[PDB]
mmCIF file of C-alpha atoms in Angstrom:
data_model
loop_
_atom_site.group_PDB
_atom_site.id
_atom_site.type_symbol
_atom_site.label_atom_id
_atom_site.label_comp_id
_atom_site.label_asym_id
_atom_site.label_seq_id
_atom_site.Cartn_x
_atom_site.Cartn_y
_atom_site.Cartn_z
ATOM 1 C CA UNK A 1 103.400 138.371 272.035
ATOM 2 C CA UNK A 2 104.732 137.817 268.364
ATOM 3 C CA UNK A 3 102.782 134.816 267.210
ATOM 4 C CA UNK A 4 99.664 136.692 268.498
ATOM 5 C CA UNK A 5 100.277 139.366 266.159
ATOM 6 C CA UNK A 6 101.079 137.038 263.367
ATOM 7 C CA UNK A 7 97.834 135.101 264.158
ATOM 8 C CA UNK A 8 95.863 138.336 264.377
ATOM 9 C CA UNK A 9 97.119 139.691 261.134
ATOM 10 C CA UNK A 10 96.898 136.346 259.255
ATOM 11 C CA UNK A 11 93.165 136.000 260.334
ATOM 12 C CA UNK A 12 92.301 139.765 259.399
ATOM 13 C CA UNK A 13 93.936 139.242 256.087
ATOM 14 C CA UNK A 14 91.706 136.089 255.552
ATOM 15 C CA UNK A 15 88.583 137.938 256.528
ATOM 16 C CA UNK A 16 89.375 140.957 254.659
ATOM 17 C CA UNK A 17 90.031 139.179 251.608
ATOM 18 C CA UNK A 18 86.828 137.071 251.959
ATOM 19 C CA UNK A 19 84.856 140.197 252.382
ATOM 20 C CA UNK A 20 86.142 141.714 249.123
ATOM 21 C CA UNK A 21 85.691 138.487 247.203
ATOM 22 C CA UNK A 22 81.874 138.230 248.205
ATOM 23 C CA UNK A 23 81.721 141.999 247.489
ATOM 24 C CA UNK A 24 83.054 141.557 243.841
ATOM 25 C CA UNK A 25 81.417 138.185 243.217
ATOM 26 C CA UNK A 26 77.902 139.558 243.282
ATOM 27 C CA UNK A 27 78.943 142.294 241.072
ATOM 28 C CA UNK A 28 80.519 140.250 238.625
ATOM 29 C CA UNK A 29 77.341 138.027 238.490
ATOM 30 C CA UNK A 30 75.121 140.769 237.528
ATOM 31 C CA UNK A 31 77.570 141.573 234.623
ATOM 32 C CA UNK A 32 77.802 138.284 233.633
ATOM 33 C CA UNK A 33 73.725 138.233 233.698
ATOM 34 C CA UNK A 34 73.783 141.351 231.503
ATOM 35 C CA UNK A 35 75.980 139.644 228.948
ATOM 36 C CA UNK A 36 73.887 136.528 228.888
ATOM 37 C CA UNK A 37 70.693 138.577 228.513
ATOM 38 C CA UNK A 38 72.362 140.748 225.788
ATOM 39 C CA UNK A 39 73.364 137.795 223.789
ATOM 40 C CA UNK A 40 69.571 136.827 223.708
ATOM 41 C CA UNK A 41 69.113 139.728 221.737
ATOM 42 C CA UNK A 42 71.808 142.133 220.772
ATOM 43 C CA UNK A 43 69.648 144.798 218.838
ATOM 44 C CA UNK A 44 70.586 148.034 220.115
ATOM 45 C CA UNK A 45 67.125 149.389 221.430
ATOM 46 C CA UNK A 46 67.002 145.688 223.606
ATOM 47 C CA UNK A 47 70.631 146.614 225.061
ATOM 48 C CA UNK A 48 69.632 149.915 225.995
ATOM 49 C CA UNK A 49 66.680 148.667 227.703
ATOM 50 C CA UNK A 50 68.578 146.026 229.766
ATOM 51 C CA UNK A 51 71.644 148.459 230.751
ATOM 52 C CA UNK A 52 68.931 150.941 232.154
ATOM 53 C CA UNK A 53 67.336 148.852 234.850
ATOM 54 C CA UNK A 54 67.677 149.795 238.182
ATOM 55 C CA UNK A 55 69.740 146.792 239.633
ATOM 56 C CA UNK A 56 72.620 147.685 237.173
ATOM 57 C CA UNK A 57 72.390 151.481 237.524
ATOM 58 C CA UNK A 58 72.181 151.301 241.203
ATOM 59 C CA UNK A 59 75.294 149.083 241.276
ATOM 60 C CA UNK A 60 77.670 150.461 238.797
ATOM 61 C CA UNK A 61 78.707 153.919 237.742
ATOM 62 C CA UNK A 62 77.544 152.911 234.341
ATOM 63 C CA UNK A 63 77.317 149.910 232.367
ATOM 64 C CA UNK A 64 77.760 149.492 228.480
ATOM 65 C CA UNK A 65 77.962 147.227 225.608
ATOM 66 C CA UNK A 66 80.665 147.691 222.961
ATOM 67 C CA UNK A 67 81.285 145.586 219.950
ATOM 68 C CA UNK A 68 83.633 144.938 217.017
ATOM 69 C CA UNK A 69 82.168 147.734 214.598
ATOM 70 C CA UNK A 70 83.128 149.984 217.402
ATOM 71 C CA UNK A 71 79.489 150.484 218.314
ATOM 72 C CA UNK A 72 78.996 151.564 221.881
ATOM 73 C CA UNK A 73 76.018 151.754 224.082
ATOM 74 C CA UNK A 74 76.227 153.137 227.653
ATOM 75 C CA UNK A 75 73.677 153.743 230.548
ATOM 76 C CA UNK A 76 73.319 156.133 232.197
ATOM 77 C CA UNK A 77 74.016 157.746 228.634
ATOM 78 C CA UNK A 78 77.138 160.029 228.646
ATOM 79 C CA UNK A 79 78.661 162.103 225.977
ATOM 80 C CA UNK A 80 82.027 160.194 225.375
ATOM 81 C CA UNK A 81 85.192 162.102 224.041
ATOM 82 C CA UNK A 82 85.569 162.780 220.195
ATOM 83 C CA UNK A 83 86.811 159.715 218.665
ATOM 84 C CA UNK A 84 86.032 157.286 221.664
ATOM 85 C CA UNK A 85 86.298 153.609 220.478
ATOM 86 C CA UNK A 86 85.456 150.911 222.930
ATOM 87 C CA UNK A 87 87.616 148.373 221.086
ATOM 88 C CA UNK A 88 90.917 150.064 222.295
ATOM 89 C CA UNK A 89 89.664 150.595 225.934
ATOM 90 C CA UNK A 90 91.339 148.316 228.575
ATOM 91 C CA UNK A 91 87.926 146.670 229.662
ATOM 92 C CA UNK A 92 87.309 145.440 226.080
ATOM 93 C CA UNK A 93 90.759 144.113 225.178
ATOM 94 C CA UNK A 94 90.955 142.191 228.575
ATOM 95 C CA UNK A 95 87.531 140.827 228.194
ATOM 96 C CA UNK A 96 87.609 140.064 224.279
ATOM 97 C CA UNK A 97 90.612 137.954 225.362
ATOM 98 C CA UNK A 98 89.341 135.914 227.983
ATOM 99 C CA UNK A 99 87.326 132.791 228.406
ATOM 100 C CA UNK A 100 85.803 134.052 231.591
ATOM 101 C CA UNK A 101 84.720 137.545 232.907
ATOM 102 C CA UNK A 102 87.535 140.147 233.900
ATOM 103 C CA UNK A 103 88.515 142.546 236.277
ATOM 104 C CA UNK A 104 90.468 145.662 235.137
ATOM 105 C CA UNK A 105 93.199 147.385 237.147
ATOM 106 C CA UNK A 106 92.623 150.956 237.856
ATOM 107 C CA UNK A 107 92.296 153.059 234.689
ATOM 108 C CA UNK A 108 91.194 156.628 233.610
ATOM 109 C CA UNK A 109 87.565 156.492 232.883
ATOM 110 C CA UNK A 110 86.793 157.936 229.362
ATOM 111 C CA UNK A 111 83.362 158.930 230.682
ATOM 112 C CA UNK A 112 84.171 160.888 233.876
ATOM 113 C CA UNK A 113 87.922 161.416 234.014
ATOM 114 C CA UNK A 114 88.253 159.658 237.241
ATOM 115 C CA UNK A 115 90.137 156.514 238.228
ATOM 116 C CA UNK A 116 87.731 153.499 238.082
ATOM 117 C CA UNK A 117 87.886 149.850 237.642
ATOM 118 C CA UNK A 118 85.807 147.786 235.302
ATOM 119 C CA UNK A 119 84.182 144.128 235.611
ATOM 120 C CA UNK A 120 83.718 143.044 231.930
ATOM 121 C CA UNK A 121 82.735 139.964 229.985
ATOM 122 C CA UNK A 122 82.201 139.015 226.604
ATOM 123 C CA UNK A 123 78.635 138.420 225.535
ATOM 124 C CA UNK A 124 78.550 135.242 223.423
ATOM 125 C CA UNK A 125 75.625 133.921 221.442
ATOM 126 C CA UNK A 126 76.157 130.377 220.575
ATOM 127 C CA UNK A 127 79.973 130.716 221.275
ATOM 128 C CA UNK A 128 80.003 133.660 218.725
ATOM 129 C CA UNK A 129 80.732 137.052 220.484
ATOM 130 C CA UNK A 130 78.375 139.930 220.079
ATOM 131 C CA UNK A 131 80.538 142.233 222.006
ATOM 132 C CA UNK A 132 81.900 143.065 225.479
ATOM 133 C CA UNK A 133 79.702 144.153 228.391
ATOM 134 C CA UNK A 134 81.129 146.101 231.176
ATOM 135 C CA UNK A 135 80.291 148.024 234.342
ATOM 136 C CA UNK A 136 82.432 150.606 236.096
ATOM 137 C CA UNK A 137 83.199 150.993 240.031
ATOM 138 C CA UNK A 138 84.986 154.251 241.199
ATOM 139 C CA UNK A 139 88.455 153.864 243.027
ATOM 140 C CA UNK A 140 86.741 155.491 245.916
ATOM 141 C CA UNK A 141 83.981 153.093 246.029
ATOM 142 C CA UNK A 142 86.789 150.472 246.535
ATOM 143 C CA UNK A 143 88.817 152.356 249.149
ATOM 144 C CA UNK A 144 85.563 152.680 251.065
ATOM 145 C CA UNK A 145 84.955 148.859 250.760
ATOM 146 C CA UNK A 146 88.562 148.306 251.912
ATOM 147 C CA UNK A 147 88.019 150.502 254.940
ATOM 148 C CA UNK A 148 84.786 149.188 256.223
ATOM 149 C CA UNK A 149 92.592 150.421 264.845
ATOM 150 C CA UNK A 150 96.021 149.287 264.372
ATOM 151 C CA UNK A 151 96.130 149.830 260.502
ATOM 152 C CA UNK A 152 94.774 149.651 257.212
ATOM 153 C CA UNK A 153 94.118 147.350 254.233
ATOM 154 C CA UNK A 154 95.177 147.738 250.737
ATOM 155 C CA UNK A 155 94.873 145.914 247.276
ATOM 156 C CA UNK A 156 97.555 144.660 245.566
ATOM 157 C CA UNK A 157 98.179 142.715 242.412
ATOM 158 C CA UNK A 158 100.263 139.498 242.179
ATOM 159 C CA UNK A 159 102.914 141.402 240.124
ATOM 160 C CA UNK A 160 103.403 143.781 243.418
ATOM 161 C CA UNK A 161 101.215 146.609 241.839
ATOM 162 C CA UNK A 162 99.372 148.664 244.400
ATOM 163 C CA UNK A 163 95.846 148.821 242.805
ATOM 164 C CA UNK A 164 93.752 150.416 245.756
ATOM 165 C CA UNK A 165 95.281 152.397 248.845
ATOM 166 C CA UNK A 166 93.904 154.836 251.179
ATOM 167 C CA UNK A 167 96.915 156.889 250.289
ATOM 168 C CA UNK A 168 95.793 157.700 246.894
ATOM 169 C CA UNK A 169 99.372 158.692 245.921
ATOM 170 C CA UNK A 170 100.321 154.815 246.310
ATOM 171 C CA UNK A 171 97.526 153.707 243.731
ATOM 172 C CA UNK A 172 99.240 151.878 240.767
ATOM 173 C CA UNK A 173 102.824 152.290 242.364
ATOM 174 C CA UNK A 174 104.737 149.064 242.636
ATOM 175 C CA UNK A 175 105.546 148.132 246.165
ATOM 176 C CA UNK A 176 109.199 148.846 245.365
ATOM 177 C CA UNK A 177 108.299 152.543 244.356
ATOM 178 C CA UNK A 178 105.899 152.946 247.130
ATOM 179 C CA UNK A 179 108.307 151.460 249.896
ATOM 180 C CA UNK A 180 111.812 151.919 248.299
ATOM 181 C CA UNK A 181 113.549 151.156 251.561
ATOM 182 C CA UNK A 182 112.674 147.560 252.948
ATOM 183 C CA UNK A 183 110.192 146.706 250.238
ATOM 184 C CA UNK A 184 107.389 144.369 251.552
ATOM 185 C CA UNK A 185 107.758 141.220 249.599
ATOM 186 C CA UNK A 186 104.656 139.047 248.900
ATOM 187 C CA UNK A 187 106.729 135.989 248.817
ATOM 188 C CA UNK A 188 107.190 136.264 252.605
ATOM 189 C CA UNK A 189 104.712 135.966 255.411
ATOM 190 C CA UNK A 190 105.511 139.007 256.976
ATOM 191 C CA UNK A 191 107.532 142.260 256.084
ATOM 192 C CA UNK A 192 108.770 145.115 258.715
ATOM 193 C CA UNK A 193 108.972 148.635 256.986
ATOM 194 C CA UNK A 194 109.456 152.169 258.588
ATOM 195 C CA UNK A 195 106.876 154.699 257.080
ATOM 196 C CA UNK A 196 106.083 158.269 258.346
ATOM 197 C CA UNK A 197 108.713 157.468 260.896
ATOM 198 C CA UNK A 198 107.068 154.655 262.515
ATOM 199 C CA UNK A 199 107.571 150.790 262.235
ATOM 200 C CA UNK A 200 104.996 148.855 260.323
ATOM 201 C CA UNK A 201 104.300 145.051 259.668
ATOM 202 C CA UNK A 202 102.758 143.967 256.369
ATOM 203 C CA UNK A 203 100.835 140.970 255.513
ATOM 204 C CA UNK A 204 99.426 139.742 252.067
ATOM 205 C CA UNK A 205 96.484 137.495 251.458
ATOM 206 C CA UNK A 206 95.173 136.034 248.185
ATOM 207 C CA UNK A 207 91.717 136.712 247.187
ATOM 208 C CA UNK A 208 90.275 133.651 246.162
ATOM 209 C CA UNK A 209 87.547 133.141 243.374
ATOM 210 C CA UNK A 210 88.084 136.148 241.335
ATOM 211 C CA UNK A 211 88.047 135.518 237.557
ATOM 212 C CA UNK A 212 91.003 136.347 235.316
ATOM 213 C CA UNK A 213 92.878 138.154 238.291
ATOM 214 C CA UNK A 214 95.257 137.054 241.008
ATOM 215 C CA UNK A 215 95.154 139.713 243.508
ATOM 216 C CA UNK A 216 96.152 140.251 247.249
ATOM 217 C CA UNK A 217 94.851 142.032 250.262
ATOM 218 C CA UNK A 218 97.732 143.881 252.215
ATOM 219 C CA UNK A 219 97.593 144.462 255.622
ATOM 220 C CA UNK A 220 99.752 147.164 257.212
ATOM 221 C CA UNK A 221 99.848 148.029 260.980
ATOM 222 C CA UNK A 222 101.911 149.937 263.255
ATOM 223 C CA UNK A 223 104.107 147.538 265.304
ATOM 224 C CA UNK A 224 104.078 149.575 268.381
ATOM 225 C CA UNK A 225 100.453 150.065 268.695
ATOM 226 C CA UNK A 226 100.034 146.529 267.574
ATOM 227 C CA UNK A 227 102.520 144.785 269.802
ATOM 228 C CA UNK A 228 101.012 146.422 272.749
#
């Protein structure tokens, strides 16, 4: 009854990881397509036109272009904080320093003030960059995708930082901070930990095929309700 829990958890981890990968992949492709189209014609009226299109506005909280002069275009348009400079934001630094698209860890959106992640990629016109295109996805949207019986899934980086968790208090806490006693180890196939008085078993599964990041799905399930 222990190698059936093990097999259950390893399989649900793989299914969860694959769901997240395919959910993110289509969104990454839209931002790459936006960056490719922006590189055709980076004039600001053309950029605005592209970012206003319904495929982007229905998929992302907003999408935007920032460039090396500090120019910024965001759609839907939104008053940015005084002094806003895209070149110092995490989406921008991540992407300008990557040969591929990127995904940020959670960070505080300058537009809305809520915690989000961004997909971002440099727009290159004959190898020369014309800026960084990004699109935003809310933390809640990610929580909702990870939660679509015995337990729950969370998203954790390969440094062991919890990135998306149904307990929002654990977002951006390391595994050690979040589980100070009996810290789940990504290096082991399973981990048992006592939480809320109950015993839980924890699995990690790498999410394949994501550009620039190395992230895992964590599965945490109650031992008792699952062993039964």
